[PDB]
Structure 1
């Protein structure tokens, strides 16, 4: 009962390192993509300066 109880607890509680590492890397790339788009969005108002105003 201890073997099976621990196995049940693992399916519920312990992490799946194969799926969690994939989720981490996806969150990293998404962070860099949002940071890059944020960098270009900061330069959007610069267009108004080119209007001689």
Structure 2
């Protein structure tokens, strides 16, 4: 019983390193994506300075 119960807690609490590592990378990528696009946007207002006489 101890074995099957230990097995059960694992299927509920234990982390699937494979799936989690995949997510950790996925998040890091989307983070880099946001960082770059944010920098692209932070420079957008500069456009005014140009059309500004």
TM-score, length basis structure 1: 0.96
Q: CA RMSD, aligned part only?
A: 0.7
Structure 2, unmatched stretches of 5+, are none
Distance 2:52 2:44 in 1: 15
Aligned equivalents of 1:52 and 1:16: distance in 2?
Answer: 56
State the Cα distance separating 1:42 from its structure 2 match.
0.3
User: How far does the alpha carbon of each residue in 1:22-52 deviate from its partner, in whole angstroms, 9 at most, with x for none?
Assistant: 0000000000000000000000000000012
How many matched pairs? Answer: 53
TM-score (norm 2): 0.96
